[PDB]
Amino acid sequence: ILTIKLFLLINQFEKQQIKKGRDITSARIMSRIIKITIIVVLVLLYGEHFGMSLSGLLTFGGIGGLAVGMAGKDILSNFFSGIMLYFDRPFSIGDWIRSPDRNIEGTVAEIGWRITKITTFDNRPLYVPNSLFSSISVENPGRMTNRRITTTIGLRYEDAAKVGVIVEAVREMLKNHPAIDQRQTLLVYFNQFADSSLNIMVYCFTKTTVWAEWLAAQQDVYLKIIDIVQSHGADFAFPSQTLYMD
Amino acid sequence: ILTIKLFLLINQFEKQQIKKGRDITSARIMSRIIKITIIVVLVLLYGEHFGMSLSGLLTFGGIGGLAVGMAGKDILSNFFSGIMLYFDRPFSIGDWIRSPDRNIEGTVAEIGWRITKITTFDNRPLYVPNSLFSSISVENPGRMTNRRITTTIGLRYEDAAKVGVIVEAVREMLKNHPAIDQRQTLLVYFNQFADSSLNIMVYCFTKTTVWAEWLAAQQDVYLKIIDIVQSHGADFAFPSQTLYMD
């Protein structure tokens, strides 16, 4: 009677699946799989009332469970990481996340029990298994406080005598710029002998975190830098070579 | 009598395989494998009525089951992932999928219990084990909402005084173009000092998602960009060098 009840229940489940709309063969095969697994479990549980010695059954069940345990590790791992994300999550719906270990970049669209759906920056959906969030470092640019401007000014080797003043000038321009956050790092220094140029690093932060505003401020700063460099009598260096001709 | 019945059943199976059409030698070897497996299982189950002490049998069965369980991990993992895909699938038949972790690019043709068949873009079939879908990130470009146009305009360093206006002009052209989606990201900014050029980024989206229509719109935009750049007295930069000769 227990087997009859279970068979009726799963047959109702299969009929419900078919009504919802699915392939005939796939539904029948799934129902047959449920048949076989239920029968195996019941025989493993009813192996003494009409069954056999509890030593062969122990070995058979152990081998089967051991194979099933190794085979099903990844699916269960994804679902466990989903529970973990439900309780402890480093991100929320709608913020931009990133990783230096894997490519998961985009904005979080949905958090599920098995996978997380992320909208990439070319407007495509990306489905990330949840277990990844238990082993990789996750960055959250959606929670940043400042945007950073970094660049290099490569002057010609003949402009060495003009390096110092130029550096000072650039620094002054950055300390009076309305878009630059004066409470963050602000560095302008000559710090590299390159192959064809002397390199000055520029390193600062903007107040805003908006993409377009940061880009506009960066363009303004770059144009001002060009003006400063050219007004002092220096120039930007192309890749350079010394040629000895026969 | 149980062994006789099982032997008759598998012999009928072998004859059916031969009738369906298969190598006779391979069928005989398969039938012999089924023989040996059935005999081993039955002895493991009937090891007390006429068998031995239930301590050596336990050890033998444990060693055998441990080896069999670790050897069969991959096949069972593929089938478990097939069941998972039957219940929870990030794609349907006919859409184009991709992955940043493995090369699986193409359009989904068939979803099976063990493998998934995908048609590549050079019209070849590719068979992907299902277990991969439990551990890699899957992108679905077949479900995209927009296509993206990104490019770089590289102007000569002598065109610095013409950067600003050019940027504005390009931006205006993108805001009046009938093929550009005005509700998405639209960025045109000077954002890079390159080795031989000043670089302006172009970043926008098209309304359509069709391949040929997107390519036609991109070609139209590129030709308009060339016209805008040349009409303002600037030019595109080749790789440049400064040469010092003896």
Side-chain angles (χ1 to χ4, degrees), chain A residues 1-62 64-246:
Chain A
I1 63 104
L2 181 56
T3 50
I4 288 307
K5 282 290 188 188
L6 288 166
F7 277 32
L8 165 87
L9 193 185
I10 77 93
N11 284 319
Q12 292 182 336
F13 159 76
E14 160 183 15
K15 277 340 206 159
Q16 153 207 300
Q17 290 271 316
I18 292 264
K19 141 153 166 197
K20 163 206 306 322
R22 221 193 254 281
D23 192 10
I24 283 321
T25 288
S26 282
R28 305 209 92 221
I29 285 201
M30 209 57 240
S31 99
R32 178 159 338 140
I33 289 172
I34 311 274
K35 269 30 172 306
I36 295 192
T37 189
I38 277 301
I39 271 44
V40 160
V41 167
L42 273 183
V43 169
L44 178 272
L45 283 205
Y46 283 173
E48 33 75 73
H49 282 111
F50 39 73
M52 231 90 72
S53 168
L54 288 322
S55 159
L57 289 201
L58 264 204
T59 288
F60 205 31
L66 177 63
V68 166
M70 294 178 261
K73 193 203 136 304
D74 305 84
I75 295 110
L76 207 51
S77 183
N78 279 325
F79 279 101
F80 283 178
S81 279
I83 291 165
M84 176 288 273
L85 283 174
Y86 174 106
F87 279 115
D88 187 296
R89 211 177 32 229
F91 50 83
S92 54
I93 300 279
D95 50 32
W96 159 30
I97 64 166
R98 217 189 65 80
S99 179
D101 303 311
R102 319 263 304 244
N103 191 353
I104 58 156
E105 182 150 27
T107 59
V108 171
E110 187 197 317
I111 298 140
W113 293 110
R114 194 186 78 84
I115 52 104
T116 299
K117 184 187 173 181
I118 283 147
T119 303
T120 74
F121 279 109
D122 41 12
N123 288 3
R124 304 171 174 185
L126 175 80
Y127 306 92
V128 183
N130 277 343
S131 42
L132 295 205
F133 298 109
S134 178
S135 46
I136 68 179
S137 298
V138 174
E139 202 191 80
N140 205 329
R143 288 177 182 167
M144 72 167 89
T145 57
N146 288 102
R147 293 246 192 192
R148 190 173 65 178
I149 293 176
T150 49
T151 197
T152 298
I153 309 167
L155 301 184
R156 298 169 310 183
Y157 267 83
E158 50 167 301
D159 300 322
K162 289 181 253 242
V163 165
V165 281
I166 279 178
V167 158
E168 262 134 16
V170 174
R171 198 183 287 130
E172 220 41 32
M173 187 270 298
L174 285 181
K175 283 158 134 52
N176 303 323
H177 205 277
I180 300 303
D181 196 345
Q182 305 297 321
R183 284 161 326 131
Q184 306 290 319
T185 297
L186 202 154
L187 303 165
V188 182
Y189 288 102
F190 161 48
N191 70 332
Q192 213 204 324
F193 287 96
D195 264 338
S196 303
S197 59
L198 313 160
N199 285 357
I200 295 156
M201 48 102 83
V202 178
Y203 190 110
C204 57
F205 284 94
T206 63
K207 297 171 190 174
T208 193
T209 58
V210 184
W211 197 357
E213 294 185 43
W214 161 65
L215 285 173
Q218 191 175 64
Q219 165 171 309
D220 203 56
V221 162
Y222 284 3
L223 289 174
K224 274 171 182 12
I225 282 178
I226 286 176
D227 261 359
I228 282 166
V229 162
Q230 255 148 38
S231 93
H232 272 92
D235 224 313
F236 297 87
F238 288 119
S240 303
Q241 296 205 66
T242 296
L243 305 181
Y244 302 96
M245 299 216 45
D246 54 359

Side-chain angles (χ1 to χ4, degrees), chain B residues 48 54 69 76 107 110 112 116 120 130 139 147 207 214 218 244:
Chain B
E48 34 75 73
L54 287 323
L76 207 51
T107 57
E110 202 212 304
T116 299
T120 75
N130 277 343
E139 200 184 67
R147 294 245 192 193
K207 298 172 190 174
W214 161 66
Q218 190 174 64
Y244 303 92

Side-chain angles (χ1 to χ4, degrees), chain B residues 92-97 104-110 117-121:
Chain B
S92 54
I93 299 277
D95 51 32
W96 159 30
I97 64 168
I104 59 157
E105 184 143 20
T107 57
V108 173
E110 202 212 304
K117 183 187 173 179
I118 283 147
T119 304
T120 75
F121 279 109

Side-chain angles (χ1 to χ4, degrees), chain B residues 36-62 64-224:
Chain B
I36 299 192
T37 287
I38 280 311
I39 272 44
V40 160
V41 167
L42 273 183
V43 169
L44 181 270
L45 283 206
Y46 285 175
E48 34 75 73
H49 282 111
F50 38 73
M52 229 87 89
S53 169
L54 287 323
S55 159
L57 289 201
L58 264 204
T59 288
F60 205 31
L66 177 63
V68 165
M70 293 136 99
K73 197 206 137 283
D74 279 31
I75 295 111
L76 207 51
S77 183
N78 279 325
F79 280 102
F80 284 179
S81 277
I83 292 165
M84 176 268 307
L85 283 175
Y86 169 106
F87 280 116
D88 187 297
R89 211 178 33 230
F91 49 83
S92 54
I93 299 277
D95 51 32
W96 159 30
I97 64 168
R98 216 190 66 80
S99 179
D101 302 312
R102 320 263 303 244
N103 192 354
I104 59 157
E105 184 143 20
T107 57
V108 173
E110 202 212 304
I111 297 141
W113 294 110
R114 193 184 77 84
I115 54 106
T116 299
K117 183 187 173 179
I118 283 147
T119 304
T120 75
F121 279 109
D122 42 355
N123 287 4
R124 305 170 173 183
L126 176 80
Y127 306 91
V128 182
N130 277 343
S131 42
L132 296 205
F133 297 112
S134 178
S135 46
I136 68 177
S137 299
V138 177
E139 200 184 67
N140 207 331
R143 286 176 180 168
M144 69 173 95
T145 58
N146 285 102
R147 294 245 192 193
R148 189 173 65 179
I149 294 174
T150 49
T151 198
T152 299
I153 310 168
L155 303 183
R156 299 168 310 184
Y157 268 84
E158 61 172 305
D159 302 322
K162 294 147 146 179
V163 164
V165 283
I166 280 177
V167 157
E168 264 143 5
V170 174
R171 197 183 288 130
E172 211 41 30
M173 188 270 297
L174 285 180
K175 282 159 134 52
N176 305 324
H177 205 277
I180 299 303
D181 198 343
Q182 304 297 322
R183 278 169 317 131
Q184 307 290 321
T185 299
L186 202 154
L187 302 165
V188 182
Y189 288 103
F190 162 47
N191 72 333
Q192 214 204 323
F193 287 93
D195 263 338
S196 303
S197 58
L198 313 160
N199 285 358
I200 294 156
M201 59 114 72
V202 178
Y203 190 110
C204 55
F205 284 93
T206 65
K207 298 172 190 174
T208 194
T209 57
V210 185
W211 197 356
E213 292 181 40
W214 161 66
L215 285 173
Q218 190 174 64
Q219 165 171 310
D220 193 67
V221 161
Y222 284 1
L223 288 175
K224 275 173 182 12

Side-chain angles (χ1 to χ4, degrees), chain B residues 17-28:
Chain B
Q17 291 270 315
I18 289 277
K19 142 153 166 196
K20 162 206 307 323
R22 221 193 254 281
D23 191 9
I24 72 96
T25 286
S26 283
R28 291 209 109 211

